[PDB]
Design a protein around this ligand. Structure first.
Ligand SMILES: CC(C)CCn1c(CN2CCC(C(N)=O)CC2)nc2c1c(=O)n(C)c(=O)n2C
Ligand SMILES: CC(C)CCn1c(CN2CCC(C(N)=O)CC2)nc2c1c(=O)n(C)c(=O)n2C
Ligand SMILES: [Cl-]
Ligand SMILES: [Cl-]
Ligand SMILES: [Cl-]
Ligand SMILES: [Cl-]
Ligand SMILES: [Cl-]
Ligand SMILES: [Cl-]
Ligand SMILES: [Cl-]
Ligand SMILES: [Cl-]
Ligand SMILES: [Yb+3]
Ligand SMILES: [Yb+3]
Ligand SMILES: [Yb+3]
Ligand SMILES: [Yb+3]
Ligand SMILES: [Yb+3]
Ligand SMILES: [Yb+3]
Ligand SMILES: [Yb+3]
Ligand SMILES: [Yb+3]
Lengths: 494, 494, 494, 494
């Protein structure tokens, strides 16, 4: 059931958010925000820089001080605030989904039914952990009483990507706040709008001032200022592996701040001859085409056993030829635009290498429309491991299909990459499902499905697809700092 | 009870250890190892470089492959191997302590009674975790069965310091092996000898070849090769904050390998007027003077409430004037040398800044002897927060004592540093012990004691004193990589 | 004789200049330009970035191609264009000086009589070199005819400082164009306006399109894009030593582009007992106070022989107390503001270290007015070599005076710095003038004067005050690339 | 006429040379030096490191002090010392050529007749410049007397390659010493021996102590110590473009030391249809095959007009098939080994890409012998611009031959590279020789010859083949620092 907003969307919040008030940039400058489906400017937003990241950090530091309201309130009350924030987002679900769809080029049905549901559910999940973060008492050698505190780390810098602006904002602030941190958030330059609306709801919910600060701006200026800042205790980043390496270097050079990264992928699927073919086709399809291919976990290499390869390719091409391109706000439209020109260019470039290096083009392979950053859904068969479209993250609607005959070999081929975010295995055989998923060097392995992500389980990459995990019980460890307290006593007893 | 070796020590193992065999360096070169108490060359050891770090990593990678003996053996058998290795070290306790004492300038009583006991106990602790590392089953939304595997990460590069060579070797390899990793270890250039003996025992114990590789050599060559290597999954390092920043940058630039660091400190003690004065004096003393001040956790800033300050200083100076300097192998000797000339120079330099910047010199303040890197135990009173001896890690036998009158102020002063490894609080008041230890930005806080370290509890720094934790249940998390497996099912039931 | 503009200044040129046309920024953004005497915004200018630096470089590259008008025109015609440009600047002298004075906080008398005269004279000087740049014929061994061509290098990136915007623009483009290069100029963010007016005159004079491109914007964005650009053959920069090191690193990492730097100073004067005291006082005064101390060559350490030290200090303080602070456009005003807040802050910070570290404050030492970045002219006597005000470039109206008794010693003290831009020697003795000036590690040494700079002689630093020389016959070498052509012949004759 | 040494060579000088005395390394370590034709160790040499580079620099700095013998001696006497050093090298010509041939794998006829003749001639050339380095007197505006001093820069760090050890040592120290600098030289790790012999002759000739210091050792240790050293005024380096970028970055980060680089090439020849075909074949052949292809200026891309392409290829292959591989000390042998395994590997790797990417292999293409680093002389025809063997410097005996039909196009292809060291043009037409050589982006262009290098003319690269020039009148500018002295006078007269 898909309700819609019964009034044109008005853009209201466009300023820097620090200490629960709206700030103009120190420079005075603003920057444009565009709608990727029309290339039209939607509004202008205040441009944060080093100078503004400093006001946000001083505020975050102040709200983190011993004796402050955020440090002294019950953990259950931190949880309460988070639940309240989720209720408010549920209240503004129609406007946030529309804003998300219009700003981020995201199908409104997905924005409303998937993105907003996931934001609300993940916040509610995080809220429940707040008063269940516990340390330990430990039977140390000698006459001592030893316990641990799982304290918040402190001021956390959090850099949000443009592909899932609201979801990723909540994946970041949810755990960080549940554990008792304060945050300085830099949403993507392309997609700052939904974050600023959420900021208004953070103020409404009653979070103490300085606990969440949101500084829209550019990666090279505001993002660099975060990663190199001397009083930021931790940085979290989701984005390309390329920028991830710069983040990790900047932390090193500056103050050795803790770093977690969720980066790109070139995630493989392995489809065995005994698999339910239609199920494998459908999940692998959605796996690569979801949100215009703009997912870190895109199933961008599909290995299919030789004897069912032809039939897999046929059914796959058939599914890809059913899309309807257009503005993501209109019902019936099933493929929106790419986010922007850089991405658009990179994708078209990569599609050309495919054709040129000699992959079989099954459909698509060019742009679409007179306005927007639209790419036709594209399928390549007979792709080989040396081709650019098998090595590089495309981040576009471009599916690679490959054959294999030997299982040992295809696992080595699946693993033969610096990436390692996710993978898929399709088979009816118990032993193969368990042994293959154990052998894949990937952070999440799906068996007979793909792209199943939930707040209850940890998510992150092996190798250069990331450091650390988000969500689940695990993700909450990355947002605490462990302190051991050891007290001399006259005599211990077990 | 202090038994000794009834024969002169012979140096036996001096080569690179890869695949359970002894290798000459690829270059052919060797480097000298000296005895810091006599400045005499003890032997020559094979010098590992990039080219040799590569042979060690290829071996570690091979031993980590799916289907290998180390990957397929029962976790309980990994535990068994570790227990066996501890029994062997217990068997060679006399020779290892002597080697440690002679190579590292460490008092033989401490080497035998503390270092060797700690190595054996910590290995036995780690051995017991091997088959108790568990993942989770998770009640994800939707019709799915989801579980996690806590897999080993892979090839771990581990860089050991010179101050506690054997203990730190075991803190590194214990957890790493218990979790199922393979390792490439680079002991300190000053102190490679005990590591190479342990390597012989790793072979005797029956570890599969390639599971532990030990490559002696230099930081700038062998250490840099580890930190920048493209097929090393994680690096662990203990040493200075300065080198720690280079390690973290190199990981960033190369392959985004995971990084844990245990770095320096400028650890404070706060002594309240109600404290047991003699107990506080004794622990603070040992806190700074242990092993010639060459401890990351040195209690190098001691803040004492004004009304008991004079009496604390008097008793402290009294204790410091009781040492007997000499070769650490002779009974009755209670202070050995510094490790080497660089450290010796840095310490004497820093002692001069004290005198010059106008701290009150209470005893010591110069070198000792005609041979060795000996520094007189040194105490400064009326030290202030701006002095070099209050800001910089000395890593030498040099105690700083300071007064305070206001508790709020002294906590801010304690916290006013980029370091954050440890701290001490001395008081009889429950509320003060709990509230002060909560307010200190330090990884371990001792109450009415100092320097109490055990395998059962996690150890690591806040801020620039480190990233991550070692030992305890916690340390074992840093040596696993979490994989989520999500399986489509027809219907789930709770 | 000081004529003035008989109409209010209107700001006309505010856009990016590429191929002799005005361009909006690719982003669409603009940035404010302020008047430092009132803190009022004067106008907004188009903000160039990487994306716009690329349009400028492609244009510069195209105008440099073999067969193009700029490459094929007579060298004498390049000279003609430069003379014409000087005539045009002479025509617009009143408006350019006013614009300079208003935008850069520069006394109008100096702007009109010194800056504009220097621009015109230096351009005319450079114009005369164009057809007098010659290579060589060389009597190589063997039967060959060998000659050299002194070709232009190619596309030169030139980054202009804010202290002398027009003068430095001409010091850069004059030689570069005379030698036949094409340029991409990034004026200072504070002072882009006069450059854009000159650009209009470059178009009027008839330079081929693409020979001069001017891209206003920020150092970290537009300046970094220049220094790291892959198709820029050379970068010239005047500014702080700090940024200079980044420029030189960026050139290294990118394309090994040639680099010339004119950086800061901490320039000394040595005043001997036999000097003409009044002359030494007057030149040393102007030496440090010229343009609010905002000169790379500021005489910021004045060493005066003990027996005339007191009298030198008295006369110096007397001269410093005669200033009249105010807006630089009003006659009678003799000290304008500092350029901006960062500089203002740094200066006030440094003045405090003086007082605190215990220099004798003779006058000044605080801000002035309710608007503007005004600092009172400040004099310190009894300054010593360890003080911050003796080691750091202040770049403000702050004079340091020091005593000496031994000539050997004071030369070592003069030289005891990483800087080395300039120095002054005041004496009546021939031998002392020659021997002292030979012994000073400085690029320009004045004898019985200071701050005498002319187009005919080379200007640049020793040590960390710069690499290379500007102006004179010398400066023209830094803008050519030497090609040797060796032709096989049957028989050579002398 | 080829005389030989009438006794087996004995290796005599193997230590670090500082202040005209022989020093053991501070570490105590030595490193092996091998004979590339037999893989046999020739001797061991003292290994210099940071710690030893510091002793060399302190010595160089002391010898450069005002009032020292090297600073105060007549320039003509610096010249005299250099002439004397050349006479001594002429005296030891037989032993130096043998040492060169044995250590560097260089044909003895070439070592004796070319390398040693070039060393002696270039030193004699440099000696004659010493008292002919002059500054200027300059007609500055105003009443001033202005002159310039062309002073030595100071301590120059000089890093010598392994391909022409003695020649390049003299190209570096000749100009540097003639201008009055002091030097710290780091010969290649492969080829330190001839440098150390020359050092003995520098002492014999009577150079003041500290004027030349020679520190054998490794690039990553001794070479890095030079490039990053804080009291070294300039660094000169010849080697790969890759290391060149590190040198230039290190200078930037450290002390902004001046930098000159002579780096790799991928130098083209253009052979027009009207050329003397046999002459073009012979020079292009020697151009690529000289010293086993181990020349920066290797003619590694030969473009031949279509109508004479086949005949050029035939004649070229014919010439390449006439070599005799073996130890370079035996008469009749015409091709020695490659310098070492790394180079050997890189060359064989690159030869494989040729075959694989589909160039026509005309002869060679594999290794030779059971000992040594020998590669068969290799010729490829029908090479195209995208192939690895057309883009990458091979530095081995591997000739690339390509066709062209359009002159405009082939000049663009010649220029379409980041390299730019040299080029060759073969034609009988005056206009084509002049216009083509003007259009080539190369530092040296030969017409109807190749590889003609002499002390009288400047040598260096455009683009990423280097910064600056060596030899000729020009090279001497890179070893001076210009000081302007401006003296106030009552009245000037022309
Ligand atoms: C990493 C994430 C944002 C991917 C988005 N996504 C969703 C919806 N998504 C948002 C709410 C999330 C939450 N609960 O927070 C649950 C997951 N569905 C997907 C995908 C997907 O990337 N791919 C490849 C898919 O195939 N499908 C089906
Ligand atoms: C970090 C560590 C190596 C410090 C060494 N240490 C020990 C003995 N040590 C070795 C075995 C370790 C184990 N169980 O692994 C237990 C701890 N005792 C100490 C200290 C100490 O540094 N300081 C400051 C002290 O005051 N005391 C008393
Ligand atoms: Cl477009
Ligand atoms: Cl478009
Ligand atoms: Cl000593
Ligand atoms: Cl000593
Ligand atoms: Cl202000
Ligand atoms: Cl102000
Ligand atoms: Cl070999
Ligand atoms: Cl071989
Ligand atoms: Yb952009
Ligand atoms: Yb378009
Ligand atoms: Yb050392
Ligand atoms: Yb000594
Ligand atoms: Yb600014
Ligand atoms: Yb103000
Ligand atoms: Yb090597
Ligand atoms: Yb071999």
């Amino acid at each position: 059931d898909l309700p819609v907003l019964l009034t044109d969307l008005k853009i209201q919040y466009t300023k820097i958010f620090i200490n629960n008030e709206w700030h103009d940039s120190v420079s005075g400058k603003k920057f444009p925000v565009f709608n990727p489906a029309t290339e039209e400017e939607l509004c202008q937003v205040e441009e944060g820089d080093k100078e503004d990241v400093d006001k946000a950090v001083k505020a975050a530091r102040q709200a983190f001080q011993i004796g402050s309201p955020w440090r002294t309130m019950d953990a259950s009350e931190r949880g309460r605030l988070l639940y309240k924030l989720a209720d408010l987002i549920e209240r503004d679900r129609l406007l946030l989904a529309t804003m998300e769809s219009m700003n981020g080029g995201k199908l409104y049905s997905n924005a409303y039914l998937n993105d907003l549901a996931g934001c609300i559910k993940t916040l509610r999940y995080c809220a429940g952990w707040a008063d269940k973060i516990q340390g330990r008492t430990i039977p140390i050698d000698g006459n001592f009483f030893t316990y641990t505190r799982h304290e918040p780390i402190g001021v956390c810098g959090q850099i949000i990507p443009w592909n899932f602006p609201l979801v990723m904002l909540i994946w970041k602030i949810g755990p960080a706040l549940s554990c008792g941190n304060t945050v300085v958030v830099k949403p993507a330059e392309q997609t700052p709008l939904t974050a600023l609306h959420v900021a208004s709801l953070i103020k409404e919910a009653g979070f103490p001032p300085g606990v969440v600060n949101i500084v829209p701006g550019y990666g090279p200026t505001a993002g660099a200022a975060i990663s190199s800042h001397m009083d930021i205790d931790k940085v979290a980043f989701t984005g390309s592996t390329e920028v991830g390496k710069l983040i990790k270097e900047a932390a090193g050079k500056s103050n050795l701040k803790r770093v977690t990264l969720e980066l790109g992928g070139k995630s493989p699927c392995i489809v065995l001859a005994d698999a339910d073919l239609d199920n494998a086709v459908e999940f692998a399809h959605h796996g690569v085409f979801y949100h215009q291919g703009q997912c870190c976990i895109a199933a961008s290499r599909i290995f299919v056993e030789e004897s069912i390869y032809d039939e897999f390719v046929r059914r796959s091409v058939e599914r890809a030829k059913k899309y309807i391109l257009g503005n993501p706000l209109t019902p019936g439209v099933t493929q929106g635009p790419q986010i922007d020109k850089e991405q658009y260019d990179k994708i078209l470039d990569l599609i050309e290498s495919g054709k040129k290096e000699g992959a079989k083009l099954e459909c698509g392979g060019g742009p679409w429309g007179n306005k927007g950053y639209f790419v036709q859904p594209t399928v390549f068969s007979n792709v080989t491991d040396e081709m650019r479209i098998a090595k590089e993250e495309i981040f576009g609607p471009v599916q690679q299909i490959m054959k294999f005959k030997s299982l040992d070999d295809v696992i080595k081929r699946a693993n033969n990459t610096f990436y390692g975010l996710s993978a898929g295995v399709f088979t009816k055989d118990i032993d193969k499902a368990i042994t293959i998923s154990s052998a894949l060097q990937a952070g999440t392995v799906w068996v007979n499905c793909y792209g199943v992500v939930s707040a209850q389980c940890p998510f992150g990459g092996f190798k250069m697809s990331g450091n650390g995990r988000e969500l689940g019980e695990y993700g909450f460890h990355e947002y605490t700092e462990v302190k051991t307290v050891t007290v001399k006593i006259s005599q211990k007893n077990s």
